[PDB]
């Protein structure tokens, strides 16, 4: 019986900087870092044992049953994901990106032709461009009704300029239930927004 | 010197059976363990077995016994590898990257990691690309990509020669098995509605190419 | 003892080349590979029922190979040549050899699988010679004395 | 301390351990660490059972 943890595992900081990262295990720990959709690589192995070929500014801080990962001079390269790894079980890791670039998102709608619903299919998408947190809430509804269940969202990588985010909500609908209201409203309330923001669009 | 490789992406159809390859020969590897890991998309890493190139004795987890299968087929100088796995009965939801990785010590650390091969199940087998445009009324503009199998399909504008804040939004899959992502490029506020711009995707697994020219 | 609450499971050999899946051994020149699959399965729970049997013996076949890669890649190959006349062979089972299964990393339940076989032949000799540690007598020893060296004049 | 050891034999098995020496303490088990599955896990006897093959 082997327990493993994590930090809070949602932590962000700036260029140049030092973080640590928090692993309780009884066994041996191998820290990997791995990069999007790429095979991760091997860090620090042991604990504190610092691998060939491994950047000084990596520190292992075995004390009791807590582990630490301080890395200096946070540097852009270093925005992966960190995870620690003992004989079989693997924790589900960390989020590491920049931090604090603040921006206001931008709930964008664009109503679509009337030929997909010849082939007897709706498809309209609410769009959330340029923010950051990721965190928000972003719901469809029929003149301003309950929505739910029948959105697939999704969001791009971190955007490299600005350090931003951007936010995708495509809606499905039937034939009746998508021209029966012609207007809709998309309110998506931030923390990058200071009040909460509601859409309105035209078909024409 | 190790270069540690894995084969490319195979596709299968649900209750098929799968079969991704992992070779090793730049150092002494007639003594080393050879793990297999695979990683639900968006999602931690999973073990999937350890085999012995000495013995080819295999070792599986409680769920993936019976259906997986570990094998070595070794060279006659023992110096040339390659490993093979194989998932037979392929389930619904089982689409991930299969990693082979190397055993350094009795630390259970991994050094060497393969390239890692994609593998996706699903019904609606292949098919070309459709892709139906969005009518603007800054600001955005879209060309949804539905109605496709299997993944990847390229995305440019203008022959590639605008792409102007482009956000393409990965390929998100649907009940249906026919994958559909939304790609917008910034564009100003007041001078939409009237300008005119052109989306041409490519569907390498089906060969298909259709040009779009949206429209207000 | 050994693990805290888990019952105990027994499978026989997952795959592998025949000398892990199978029990290799030898007898008076030629080899033998005797499946032993039936004294390899079991479970064991809470112990509350007793199930009694007969004496019944149990009967393994074993199949017989000639051409034995006995070591992986060092051995030379061989080619045993058949033995004149019934042979028996009588010997003890002294050790076995297992090997554990890896856990899940979602919820285990409460049990743990042993499988037989496997290893390479070091451990045939490791389970022996593991009371016997190797040392060198350093037998010059320094210690004060009140003795000095009456030194001639 | 002895001299040196006792009789071993080179007896080769795989599955088995045939015809080696018995522990008079009880049903022992070895290994590496019986935490780490990669080593294996080697179980003695104190009764041997009779083999007939
Ligand atoms: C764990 O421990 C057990 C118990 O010791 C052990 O089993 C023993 O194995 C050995 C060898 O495997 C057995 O020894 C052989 O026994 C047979 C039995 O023959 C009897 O019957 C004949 C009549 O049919 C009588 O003539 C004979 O005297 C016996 O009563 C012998 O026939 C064998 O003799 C051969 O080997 C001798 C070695 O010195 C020679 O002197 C003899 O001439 C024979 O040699 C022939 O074959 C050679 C090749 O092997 C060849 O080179 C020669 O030129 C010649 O052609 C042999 O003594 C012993 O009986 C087993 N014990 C019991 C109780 O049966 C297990 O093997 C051990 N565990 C493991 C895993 O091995
Ligand atoms: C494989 O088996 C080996 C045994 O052969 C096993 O070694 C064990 O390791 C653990 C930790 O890795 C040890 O636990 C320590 O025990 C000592 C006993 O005094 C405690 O003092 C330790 O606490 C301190 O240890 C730190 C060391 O720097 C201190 O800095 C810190 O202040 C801690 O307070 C710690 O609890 C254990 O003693 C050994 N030996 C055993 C268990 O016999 C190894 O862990 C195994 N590998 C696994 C399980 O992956
Ligand atoms: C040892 O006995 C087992 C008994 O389970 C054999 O396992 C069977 O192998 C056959 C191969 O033709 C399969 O079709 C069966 O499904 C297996 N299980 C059962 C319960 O029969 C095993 O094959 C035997 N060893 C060898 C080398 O044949
Ligand atoms: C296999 O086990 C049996 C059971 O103990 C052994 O029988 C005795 O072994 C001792 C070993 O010191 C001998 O001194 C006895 O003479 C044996 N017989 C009896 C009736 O006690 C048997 O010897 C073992 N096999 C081998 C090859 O030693
Ligand atoms: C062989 O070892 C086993 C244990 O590994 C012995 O069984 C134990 O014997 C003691 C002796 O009083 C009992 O207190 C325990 O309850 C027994 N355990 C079990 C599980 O039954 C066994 O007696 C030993 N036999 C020989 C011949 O040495
Ligand atoms: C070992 O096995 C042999 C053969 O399997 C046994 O020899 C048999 O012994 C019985 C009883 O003495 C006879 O009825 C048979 O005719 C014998 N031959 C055969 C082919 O069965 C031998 O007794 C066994 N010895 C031990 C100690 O188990
Ligand atoms: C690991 O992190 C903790 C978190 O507060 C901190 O005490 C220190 O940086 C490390 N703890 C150690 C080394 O014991
Ligand atoms: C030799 O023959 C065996 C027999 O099956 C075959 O498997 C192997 O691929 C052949 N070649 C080598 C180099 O062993
Ligand atoms: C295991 O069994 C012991 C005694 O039978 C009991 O005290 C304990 O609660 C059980 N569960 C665990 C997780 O130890
Ligand atoms: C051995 O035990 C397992 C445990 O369930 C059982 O399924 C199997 O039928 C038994 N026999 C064989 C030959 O595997
Ligand atoms: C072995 O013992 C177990 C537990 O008592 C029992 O379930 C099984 O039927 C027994 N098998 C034989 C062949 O005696």
Sequence with gaps: ?204 | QVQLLQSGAAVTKPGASVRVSCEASGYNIRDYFIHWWRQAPGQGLQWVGWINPKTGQPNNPRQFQGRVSLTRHASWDFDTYSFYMDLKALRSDDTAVYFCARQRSDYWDFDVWGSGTQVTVSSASTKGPSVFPLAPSTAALGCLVKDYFPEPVTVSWNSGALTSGVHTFPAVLQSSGLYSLSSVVTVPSSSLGTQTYICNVNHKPSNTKVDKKVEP | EHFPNKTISFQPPSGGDLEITMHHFNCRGEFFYCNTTQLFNSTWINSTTIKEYNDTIIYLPCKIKQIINMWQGVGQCMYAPPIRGKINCVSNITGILLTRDGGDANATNDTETFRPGGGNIKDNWRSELYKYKVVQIEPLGIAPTKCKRRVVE | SVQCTHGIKPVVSTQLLLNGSLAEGEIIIRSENLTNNAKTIIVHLNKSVEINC
């Design chain 1, 1 to 204: 019986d082997i327990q493993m943890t994590q930090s809070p595992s949602s932590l962000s900081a700036s260029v140049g900087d030092t973080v640590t990262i928090t692993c309780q295990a009884n066994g041996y720990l191998n820290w990997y870092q791995q990069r999007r959709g790429k095979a991760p690589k091997l860090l620090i192995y042991d604990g504190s044992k610092l691998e060939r070929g491994v950047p000084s500014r990596f520190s292992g801080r075995r004390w009791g049953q807590e582990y630490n990962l301080t890395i200096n001079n946070l540097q852009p390269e270093d925005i992966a994901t960190y995870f620690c790894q003992v004989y079989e079980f693997v924790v589900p890791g960390t989020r590491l990106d920049l931090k604090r670039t603040v921006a206001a998102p931008s709930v964008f709608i664009f109503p679509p032709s009337d030929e997909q619903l010849k082939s007897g299919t709706a498809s309209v998408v609410c769009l959330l461009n340029n923010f950051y947190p990721r965190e928000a809430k972003v719901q469809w509804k029929v003149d301003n009704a309950l929505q739910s269940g029948n959105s697939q969202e999704s969001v791009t990588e971190q955007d490299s300029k600005d350090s931003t985010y951007s936010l995708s909500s495509t809606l499905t609908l039937s034939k009746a239930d998508y021209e029966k209201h012609k207007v809709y409203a998309c309110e998506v309330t931030h923390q990058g927004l200071s009040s909460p923001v509601t859409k309105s669009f035209n078909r024409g």
